[PDB]
Amino acid sequence: MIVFRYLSREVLVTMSAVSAVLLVIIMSGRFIKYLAQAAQGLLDPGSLFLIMAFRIPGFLQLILPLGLFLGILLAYGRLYLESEMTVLSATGMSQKRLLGYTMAPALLVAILVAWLSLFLAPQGINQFALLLNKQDTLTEFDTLVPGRFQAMRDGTRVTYTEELSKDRGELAGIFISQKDLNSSNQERGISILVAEKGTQNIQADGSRYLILHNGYRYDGNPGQANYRAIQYDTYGVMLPKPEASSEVSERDAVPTADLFGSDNPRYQAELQWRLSTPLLVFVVTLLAVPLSRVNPRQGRFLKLLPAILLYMGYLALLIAVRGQLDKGKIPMAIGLWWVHGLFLAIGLLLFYWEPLRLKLASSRA
Amino acid sequence: MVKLDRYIGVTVFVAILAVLGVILGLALLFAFIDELNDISASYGIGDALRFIFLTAPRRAYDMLPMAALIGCLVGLGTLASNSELTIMRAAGVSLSRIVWAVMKPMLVLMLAGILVGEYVAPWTENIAQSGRALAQGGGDSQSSKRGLWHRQGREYIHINAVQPNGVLYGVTRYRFDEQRGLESASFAKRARFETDHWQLEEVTTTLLHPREKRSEVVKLPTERWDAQLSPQLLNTVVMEPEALSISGLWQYIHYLADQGLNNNRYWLAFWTKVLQPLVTAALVLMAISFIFGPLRSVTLGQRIFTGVLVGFVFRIAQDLLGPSSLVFDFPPLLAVVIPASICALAGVWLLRRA
Amino acid sequence: MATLKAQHLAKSYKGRQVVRDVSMSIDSGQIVGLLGPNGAGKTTCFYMIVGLVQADQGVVRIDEQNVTHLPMHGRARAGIGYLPQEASIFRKLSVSDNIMAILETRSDLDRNGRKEALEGLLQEFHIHHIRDNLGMSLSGGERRRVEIARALASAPKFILLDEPFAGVDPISVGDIKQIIHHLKAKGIGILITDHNVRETLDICETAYIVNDGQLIAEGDAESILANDLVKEVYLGHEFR
Amino acid sequence: ATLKAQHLAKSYKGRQVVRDVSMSIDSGQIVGLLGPNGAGKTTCFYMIVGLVQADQGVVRIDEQNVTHLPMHGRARAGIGYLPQEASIFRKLSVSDNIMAILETRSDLDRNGRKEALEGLLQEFHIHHIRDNLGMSLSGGERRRVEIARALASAPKFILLDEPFAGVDPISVGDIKQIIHHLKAKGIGILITDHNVRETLDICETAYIVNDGQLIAEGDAESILANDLVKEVYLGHEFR
Ligand SMILES: CCCCCCCCCCCCCCCCCC(=O)OC[C@H](COP(=O)(O)OCCN)OC(=O)CCCCCCCCCCCCCCCCC
């Protein structure tokens, strides 16, 4: 009961330090991405310490399992190098007992990760989306440049104005090409709403509010002779910020209570994804105890980068399987539990390698 | 001092080559995994593999300084942990001579880096990007994300793909009249540059007289185009500013300066590509200071971990200070000089402390 | 009265053969030394007895109970202790906690039994005056005494010391020899391997010389120092 | 020549390790540096070598004062050094091992370097292993090649660090033979080691350092009869 709270203190302290460093690095990378986007002109520099503040729970929920993995590796490597566990084993301590000692901090980490996954990351993502969409820090239409075109997604929508003025009114021409990605063969969905005057307005009720002062709308695809001419005024079209919708979807912000009774495959796949991040905690706890056996020649730091690569592969495989799930291909009965079982089996292979070798040698003689 | 120089140089060179190989392999694997997301019918597995393998020299040239730093750390720590540098110092060989011995291969390495980044990386990068665009872009008038848009007097052109040898794909022209009516909307499969002539082969224009009549689709077999789009300029705009050669970057910076646009994004690329030797020299100097100081007895894994962490921090700072120069008001030169400057300062400090 | 018998041990690293048919035997209350040239199979034999190296041939049994295939904790539960060469004290645990962390795992002791055992181990080894200092603030002698008391806390039948007279002052070997004599008086079959031939042969009442992976000699100090083969391959002709 | 360390001192964090230790190694003299492990003996050895910056005192090699010169400056002044661990150039052959240091010497030309290499190979009986890589050498051959390489730089004093460390009683004869061969050349060997008996045997004068102070000096007989030494370091039962 003394070794228990000795190992559980070492592991927790090392995990805290590693998690802090990893969080700093990940936040820095996301900040370089958002700063480059703001440099391009599609963001408000003032609204940058809330975008990063509302994304911390997701980074923490993705980092804490890796923090525990590396903390277990470092702490138990230190104990192995200092001849401190050879005297625990030479007095009676098993390796299943070591696993049982290690599974106590893993429970606290799993509880923290489960809370972050099921009740705090959805709220943070919801608030982040609320800000970036509703509060319209500055829309892309407030960054127009005369003579230069502007596009979105796969060039599906290209907005351009010939004249740019401080009053933002009576613009020479609004060349907008709102194209449907799929609208069947006969109609390509590509339409041009060009007006003699640019009617930029308050843009408050429906986010970016845009209407044509005079109106000249054509739905005729250039390939065929079918021309759809609407020379009347074009009705108000509501433009959302592509950045907010591109990275954050509705599935990442719905409350967890709405996923239990849902039938939409996306919601069920998201629920299965949420109840997995606590599970990597136990999986990597089982994967880490056998791997932390080191020699003074190897040291603690030799197998940290391979562990990071293994964890990243785990996460990538989980994300890919979730995509194949909510796309309707993989049946929802099996889910991501087969990936979880694959990595659990890898961990069990690592754990029982030495007992298997000893039992094989015993029967050989 | 010939045998010692060759010994140290060979060790450092081999370590740097191995580290560069491993880093490039990891980068290529990550790039392929990311590119798998945009798989499609027109863009197959073979096309993605070809693009990934064709953008190898660009990644190698970009990641050369990190390979130099980590390889110098590993190779010099191999000698330091074996007490083979204490013997050199106790035989009368100073620290400056060891630094120069390590630095001699670095000159040839950075010369090769400059040569590749000016002659080989732009060529293969242009070949690769053009290919991905041709594959992912032959569908229709507005299909690809890698397209280009331009404005004439009243015409509006959208080129789906821009290929090196003055040939475009999916050229679409909208010719509005004075009353903003669609006088003619056309789509052409290909084009060819012949001085002032652009030949829009396979052009199917759909002109419309707005005097209450139907649009007449006309199948012209070949059309002349009075385009003011020079292919040499076209290849530059569709390419990232960091994927251009040093000479091409210089020419485009001056061309942008003449008209009056903002070339501060291209000055950063010019400084990054030109001042690379100084950055690698500062990184290897700090690695040498690390070996002679804190890490003269630690194991190989700790040296690799420290090198990776320092490289990550250096790249994060470099990428943070790039857009910061454009959003704020300070020259882009300080976005390249500062990190290498403090790295050299720390290396000199730790070397002076012996 | 126990007996730790190693019979026909053999081990082959790479394709070469390091150890070849080395047979040992340590009784209870007996001090045995395992000496030999550095390149020979002395350390390999010691580790194969300890459990850190798996013997290819041969068996290791204590009182008609094969422990050759058991892991290190299996041997430890069978009654075979082990004390590593370097410092192996719990750095952040007090001296009393060092012994109590091992006393708490004994299934034949209750709370009162653990209390009395800790008191006895503290008084017997004269470490009671430092029963609250952290293990990282102990000198060499106190550290060694605390390590030996911690090893005894698990009640072993045999203790295998690995280089006890390693990097210690001539005054410090007196404390180590006193501790070893105390262990022999308690009834524990110590086995020592060391580079220091003089003090090992002084303290040990029986020695085994292993050269070229074979047992080339056996006997007390007088028989070892009067052997032509040992004086030829190990000690030279000018030893003492 | 004569190497003098005077009034040496060195204080680590907070505490003091070495306080006013003074030695003197002549030419053709074998001198030991013994004492308890904790005391400032290794620190004094390293401060003489040049691996630790002395806070006070002066290290003078003959007339020159080299207390401020770095390790390579001291080595150019004529102070050798042989580390305890293996320090042979692993990927270089034995002849290349000696030659890589012979090329450093500036007073030798090509023919002189060749003749010196041949003499060094013949003198230490390594002429039959001159084409073996440094990583494929046994302990005795490796130590002989290391000593030859140390001599290749033409030093005046060689400061051996733990020569009799973890070696068989057979090999101490070879080590003593090499040390006496070096002394016969005119080199002021200085040995610090844990092995008290062997060091007191081979040496001619000993320096005991306890609690950062020189508590005894002189030949082996006077060292073994000293009461203070017999009470702090050796013990009353030591021979
Ligand atoms: C279209 C182009 C496509 C390019 C794709 C390239 C993909 C490469 C990915 C695989 C590379 C893995 C290599 C990892 C090897 C690590 C293993 C190791 O320890 O190697 C050590 C090895 C020993 O060398 P040895 O001969 O023993 O040296 C002593 C001799 N005096 O040391 C070695 O010398 C072996 C390692 C050599 C690695 C060479 C590869 C890196 C250099 C190329 C960089 C990329 C540049 C491409 C374009 C260049 C144009 C000029």
Residue numbers in the entry:
A (entry chain F): 1 to 365
B (entry chain G): 1 to 354
C (entry chain B): 1 to 240
D (entry chain A): 2 to 240
Direct quotes from the study:
Three distinct conformations of LptB2FG, designated as LptB2FG-I, LptB2FG-II, and LptB2FG-III, were captured in our cryo-EM data and solved to resolutions of 3.34 Å, 3.26 Å, and 3.31 Å, respectively. The main difference between the three cryo-EM structures of LptB2FG is in the conformation of the β-jellyroll domain, which appears to perform a rigid body rotation motion with respect to the outer leaflet of the IM, transitioning from one conformational state to the other. The TMD and NBD domains of these three structures are essentially the same. In contrast to all the reported structures of LptB2FG determined by cryo-EM, our cryo-EM structures did not reveal any density consistent with the presence of LPS within the outward-facing cavity of the TMDs. This cavity has a volume of 5,473 Å3, approximately half the volume observed in the X-ray structure (10, 513 Å3), suggesting that the previously solved structure may represent an LPS-bound conformation. Intriguingly, our structures of LptB2FG exhibit an open V-shaped cleft at Interface 1, oriented toward the outer leaflet of the inner membrane, while Interface 2 remains entirely closed. This structural feature is expected to facilitate lipids entering the TMD domain of LptB2FGC via Interface 1. The distinctive structural attributes characterising our cryo-EM LptB2FG structures strongly suggest that we have captured the resting state, or substrate-free conformation, of this transporter. We identified four lipid molecules in LptB2FG-II and LptB2FG-III, likely originating from the nanodisc preparation used for sample reconstitution. These lipids were modelled as phosphatidylethanolamine (PE) moieties, arranged on the outer surface of the LptB2FG complex.
